[PDB]
Design a binder for this molecule. Sequence first.
Ligand SMILES: Nc1nc2c(ncn2[C@@H]2O[C@H](COP(=O)(O)CP(=O)(O)OP(=O)(O)O)[C@@H](O)[C@H]2O)c(=O)[nH]1
Ligand SMILES: Nc1nc2c(ncn2[C@@H]2O[C@H](COP(=O)(O)OP(=O)(O)OP(=O)(O)O)[C@@H](O)[C@H]2O)c(=O)[nH]1
Lengths: 189, 50, 439, 428, 427, 427
Amino acid sequence: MEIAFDLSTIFTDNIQRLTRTDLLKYGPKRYWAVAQSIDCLGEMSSKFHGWKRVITMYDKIVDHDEEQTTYIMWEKVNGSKSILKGLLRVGYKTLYLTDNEQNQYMEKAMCILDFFVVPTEQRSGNGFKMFDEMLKAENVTVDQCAFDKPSAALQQFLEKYYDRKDLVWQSNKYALCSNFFIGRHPTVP
Amino acid sequence: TSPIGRNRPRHDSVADLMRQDMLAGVRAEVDPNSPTGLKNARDFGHRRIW
Amino acid sequence: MREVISIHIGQAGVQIGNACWELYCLEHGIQPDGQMPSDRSLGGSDDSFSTFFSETGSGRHVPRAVMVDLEPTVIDEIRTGTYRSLFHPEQLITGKEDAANNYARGHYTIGKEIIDLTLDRIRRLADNCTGLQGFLVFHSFGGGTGSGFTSLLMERLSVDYGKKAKLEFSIYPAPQVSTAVVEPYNSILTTHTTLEHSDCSFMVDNEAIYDICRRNLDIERPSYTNLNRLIGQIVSSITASLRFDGALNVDLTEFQTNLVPYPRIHFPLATFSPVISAEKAYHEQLSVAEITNMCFEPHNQMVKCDPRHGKYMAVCLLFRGDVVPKDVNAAIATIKTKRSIQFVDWCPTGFKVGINYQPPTVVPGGDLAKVPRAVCMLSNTTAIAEAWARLDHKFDLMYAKRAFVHWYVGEGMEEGEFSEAREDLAALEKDYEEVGVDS
Amino acid sequence: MREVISIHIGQAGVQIGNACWELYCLEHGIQPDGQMSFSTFFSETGSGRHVPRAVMVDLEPTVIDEIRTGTYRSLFHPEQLITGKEDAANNYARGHYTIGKEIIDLTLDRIRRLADNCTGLQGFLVFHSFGGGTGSGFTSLLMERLSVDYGKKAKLEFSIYPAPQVSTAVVEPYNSILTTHTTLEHSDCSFMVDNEAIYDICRRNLDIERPSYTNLNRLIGQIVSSITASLRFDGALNVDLTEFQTNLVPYPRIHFPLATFSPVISAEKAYHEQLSVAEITNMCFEPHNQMVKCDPRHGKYMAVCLLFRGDVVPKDVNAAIATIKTKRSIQFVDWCPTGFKVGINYQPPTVVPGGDLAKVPRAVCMLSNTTAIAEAWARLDHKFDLMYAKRAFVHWYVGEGMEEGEFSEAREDLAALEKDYEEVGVDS
Amino acid sequence: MREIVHIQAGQCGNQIGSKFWEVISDEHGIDPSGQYVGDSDLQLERINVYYNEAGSNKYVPRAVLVDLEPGTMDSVRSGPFGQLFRPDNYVFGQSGAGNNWAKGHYTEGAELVDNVLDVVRKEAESTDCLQGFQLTHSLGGGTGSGMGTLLISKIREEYPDRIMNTFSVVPSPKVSDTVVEPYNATLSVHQLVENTDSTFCIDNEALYDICFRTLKLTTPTYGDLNHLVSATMSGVTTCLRFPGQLNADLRKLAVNMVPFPRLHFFMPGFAPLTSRSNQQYRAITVPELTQQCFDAKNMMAACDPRHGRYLTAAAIFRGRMSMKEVDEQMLNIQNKNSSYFVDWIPNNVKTAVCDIPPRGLKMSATFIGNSTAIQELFKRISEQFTAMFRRKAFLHWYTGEGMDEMEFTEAESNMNDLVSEYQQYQE
Amino acid sequence: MREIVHIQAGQCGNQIGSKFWEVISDEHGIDPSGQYVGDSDLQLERINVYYNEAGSNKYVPRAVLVDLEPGTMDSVRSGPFGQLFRPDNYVFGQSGAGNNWAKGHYTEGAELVDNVLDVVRKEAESTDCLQGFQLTHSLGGGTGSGMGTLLISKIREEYPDRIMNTFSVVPSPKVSDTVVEPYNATLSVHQLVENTDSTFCIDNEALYDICFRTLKLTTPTYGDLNHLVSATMSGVTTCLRFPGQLNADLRKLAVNMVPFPRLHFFMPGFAPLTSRSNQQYRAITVPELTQQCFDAKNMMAACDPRHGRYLTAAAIFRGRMSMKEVDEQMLNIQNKNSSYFVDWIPNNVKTAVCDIPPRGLKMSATFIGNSTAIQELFKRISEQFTAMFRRKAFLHWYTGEGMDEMEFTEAESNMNDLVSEYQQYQE
Ligand SMILES: Nc1nc2c(ncn2[C@@H]2O[C@H](COP(=O)(O)CP(=O)(O)OP(=O)(O)O)[C@@H](O)[C@H]2O)c(=O)[nH]1
Ligand SMILES: Nc1nc2c(ncn2[C@@H]2O[C@H](COP(=O)(O)OP(=O)(O)OP(=O)(O)O)[C@@H](O)[C@H]2O)c(=O)[nH]1
């Protein structure tokens, strides 16, 4: 939860974009703070989900075959001690899509790998700023991103903001909006 | 590129484990549409009747 | 953790394996190249995909399957098809040339050339396994490659493992649709080995699925792909209990205990009741009662045999989807009310119910309509004896003239083996006749 | 901080150095023209140019001219590319006595200049081949002079050893026998490698139908990178060169260990393999996976060093070591119950673009001192005795300044070394 | 002071036990996370009967969850109340018994029962005074029917004095779901007869009938059946956990309900069972509660109580009420149906009143019946077993596992002897 | 008032010391920059024992960092608590000793020990009253063992009265990683016996076994082992820094443990080690704490404690707890396990209580046991040393530095003497 480092000296703003290149530039050789923060955030995410494994750590992110980006928000508390607040991950992956009436599709989509915020900061409008900052950063809309097995709160948020409800499920455990503007279906439904 | 430094060997997991204080005690609700959620809501669960 | 090993032999076995593995990849959300894009699901229902797919150090998933054939072209299709990277390359075992639809070639001469490699690959796969539940075998009785290699390999698997379950879904020869002029010989020969070294064998008739697709699916001229998809649906419905949670689960041990009254009576039927086209299914609710009624309809059987001419001994109903036990009880009561479905008097409760909340999965562009619930009926009945009687009659007629004895005996075969297999199958038919009479 | 000097003699050594320096540039991100932790292998100039700490010497300039016109022409400082006028013609006597002295002074002066450039000189690296004339006479002269000058400094070398069947020169046994005397005299630890074994490895594991010298040199460079990684990359249980020598040299003369890089498998097959620590450790000891054409089961293991790289956990290493020890087939000397030298590095190996190696997550290089290596000495001694019983080609050597008795002295030294190998392996 | 140890075997037993602890935590005011959230100290004054305390206001159940297949184990752990249980109490083998009595009773149960006995004994020695063990299992399955009986025999060996309760589910042909279940039932009946102090037979057909008509549930599932069973669970033992005018523990119920040692098969029921729409249609008071405790269609067992006279009956009431009103209702019920009770017993029914009713109900009554009508289910199971054994329908599996025809004949003879003993008092 | 000088030699020593300083800063609420950010005034009451005042509310450890490989020093400086130390205290050489005891003791160690002793003396003269020296090192390596032996000899020569305790990591065959490590261990145990008031043996195999069994860690790392050692070390010296009902500092412990001057090898342990799941469901109590302290598995020596007899044992407790509850537990332990304690000592057990527990922990117990079972490690080391010395396995490397072969023979005899005297009281 709490990190014993002043994140302002390394992070420019409250919410930072961390591409694989940025992780390389923020290596844990002398910047252990950011690696420890991301690992603790992933561990908290897995503990909340009650899983037997963790899916968000520095090593697999930097070793991941495809490029990925990470968004972290924090808060200044002490001179050399700060607090961890949230996390956010997304990246490019290729998927085979199928909409209503069994129509095959294939395209590159923004697959959000994970969402999590610290339980002590639950509710009170946390993470919507992350949503907005990401969609401004890579200039994509909600309809253009893919969701990886959303939990109930996630499509609740999608109907709360942007009113994207009735998420369509996919055979590959992914979920997307009912609006598929990509077209170019390989197979006639 | 550059050499890849792994924090996993430098990770200290017993620090939480040795500390009797635990951030656990909270569980994520299973999706009702999921087979686990369906089982939990129907076979495990029961709608009030008295 | 529980896992199973699937073995596919011959062109029929390989194609069935391709179809069923496509269905498994779709069910578990696995890409055709072996990737699992669902990162979150990797930490959740791990056992589901781990039942059929092994986990690699790179995050990829390798199916626990063995692609073996005496000729490479059918396997070359996989190495060139969409799923080329799905399967581990070493499990794609290819011989030099086919068996030319000869059981002796696949049992004595050519089989032994790669049986050692196949056993080594199976041993390597099993060593990585920890909670192995059984083996799935896919082959065709009437062919030469399948009937020979399965005969050679089943005994080796039995002596290697023993108590481990061995389940095979095989295409039984059609009473009227003949593809190979010498298929009855191979069928009679493999009947001996499939009886001794198995736990339960599921008969399949090509003409049965032909007429089922003609009637229910309205497609006049189906290809082998539709049959492969339906058999994949059968096997997925059977195995859904192991890899998914449900009320009143039926695993391999429960299935074998319920559906095998005697060691030689392990030849049950198989049928998927809710087969219907997309346009037709929209007009019916397909509730539990009607699908349960369709279960016992002779037209819905995937083996060309008349159930009314025989009787049901034990029946298993592996319901999947939105099913509650009250509907199952009402359906079973209604089934027991009618006297057309006649049961043996010594087995009053020969029904084994199994329910899973996992809905059936339909492939994109699939013939099967999306349905909330599905039931896969597995029944041990004496009506299967008529097909065996017809096959024995055809075998006797062919062997009386010694029409193709020379081809077999030229590949290390003894003529007495034909008589031995014939008398074994005759004794098995007599065993069904004896067990079918009421006390 | 901790620098090491590499010296290349002969065509084989020059090509192996080319490959290893390409691999080092790939690992450290140094551009092929020298543009851009790395202090071990490179010296950073003020202008930003990175110069490898390597010496390129060959009596025939063609192989050096290949680099001087190749991709890495700007990588190496020009004075490091020492060249002669004509090769040794595969003659050890020509390589050393009559010719090598012409440029040995310049070569040793360049070595001294490079050594004075750095401060933490851990040791020396020499790449050469026993069969060749230059890489045996010039190597002998240069390394004996280097040992005389420095002494206590570490001296490591990687020597190519003639195959039982693959012999590209008829006079290979003579030069190999002549060099074996002095490689036992000055080299602190010699890494002997056979080309035929690498060919077999490429044919079997990598499934390459038509191997080439490029693949062999790439594998050798990978092994050199693995052994030298502990001096330049972080990781628990670091293994320094001095630690390495202390671990694998139980006797002053028994310093000829084997070498192998285990996770060599095709890319289309690597993706479908777990590549666990236990599995790779077990297949390290495969008899056909050793790059010296001798069966380890024939001899007995005496001192084994493992250098794990990438995602490695010490508990998995301990489990693998216990499983290996339980395997009675992998025999060990009774007087060294703890001969396993475990080393772990956090830096995963890199893959050369176009190279046959796949991007494994973890890798380990196994270096074992075993008595099974005596088979190579037996083969070489048999060949030399057969070729010298009738004095096949003694006239060239005696005419190029060396004495007839030198051959007999080398043969008796080889016999003594084989006797020492036989004696050290007996139980106590 | 009077602690109780719970054992759960098989998937059915584990489900019923999970519902049991859910209901008990509801009554005892325990949060699913394991923290006490109750308001009345009476809920906590004797919480030691079921829950061991961790000191930091945290309680863990005194339960032994065990099953051959780990699938049921992690299914329970993933449940809403699965977190509450102690991880060291989760015992499992490799795979399920396969509905095979021999597999769960002679080989696989043979290995697992050592660890099960170890954990049970360790957990029992932590109690000040363990009154006894109460267990939930299913007769129709293999895991329960075999291994639970083996554990019962072992515990009886290790604890000849402590009371034993076997809240078990018996199979019936009407809602039969397993082909081989009669074999398990006949193999387990003798063990239950010879190693149990109190047995409460339960049938799913009776549960479905009650839900369909008595309670009018549109589409009840196993959850509601287990909830009714758990309501009976709490009702039978409500005396030990709360004060009452007529305080009767499980020992007193056993003494009143067991005229003879081999007649310890009971038949339970729940009184306030009424549909949601009929809550205002009916007002609740002692007369109709007492009447419903003896109603045939409100009874937890499939067998009709009319065909067999009650030997002894037990009505355990809860909540504030008048003792004399209860006595008058019981005497009126006894007199108005004297043909339904044995004459040689001067007073068949013995009651017990608690001062705390279940939450959501003004007052509740739990019925226990030692009626001779139980012999009907045993007769049906025995005739099914005879029909199956006349041709040895599935004997080969058990014989391969090590079973013999002699054991089958002995079990059938013992169960027929029990039926004959019931018929002896059936006049 | 009773300050302690802390020195870290060898890579393992530096890592353990870094983890220990991190743990102490966590206990004392000290910022990694050295500033005090604690929430209690009791921490600053005795912070001077381990830290030196820097004026502006900043505190720096009284630690001396020495290592011949600058990479370890660079890693520590770049680590999470690198800035906690001051750059003056850092000491390093050019290259490591290369696992060569002679290299690290006769030439390179001899050249570095001048600066090492200079900085150690400069730190020592700045104290108010130097209670003693503590040093972290590993016997298996070359640099750590040689430098530790040389430095402990030098400090004993310079400080003939102060307490010297060394927290050494004893190599074991199961997790052996160095070929020549038995030689280093044989050469170091000589000086440890000669000039150390107390040496705490630590085995990596035992730590891995504890982490796998009790902790149930998925994949333990060196960080976890260092954390365990750090927690034990902090527990040992808790009497000096915090008040308690019964104070037991280094001198009192040293008096109460050793029966004879040269039998000064202790085997530590730590109580509250609990897995993730069992943390919330284990009633941590003084009986539980002492049971796990005396548990064989929890012990950090690979030797089985039951394969010997305890001479003297001390358990140091932290947190509020009644004295009688601890005394009764100690009497129960000494009575039940009387066969494991020597009879010739009237009271084999030593007790200690501290009022302030480790941060985030309700109460903890630290166990140290001086049992004859430690002789098994020395027996294995002597066996390996004799096996290697029989054929002169690696003696040429050590003789190259001028060290005589006769030293090996004398050390082996002293190894026998240490085993013999331990075997002398072993019965
Ligand atoms: N009232 C309930 N009966 C159940 C429930 N689940 C199963 N059963 C009954 O269980 C009976 C079969 O017993 P089990 O399911 O425990 C099978 P077994 O004992 O062999 O255990 P497993 O091997 O672990 O499956 C059958 O008559 C079912 O109707 C449930 O949730 N409630
Ligand atoms: N592994 C390997 N061996 C090589 C390579 N190039 C040459 N060799 C070996 O080197 C030997 C040939 O003799 P050289 O050492 O090149 O000859 P030299 O007389 O010393 O030097 P040159 O005359 O300049 O070639 C044979 O053993 C070759 O197989 C190479 O790229 N890789």
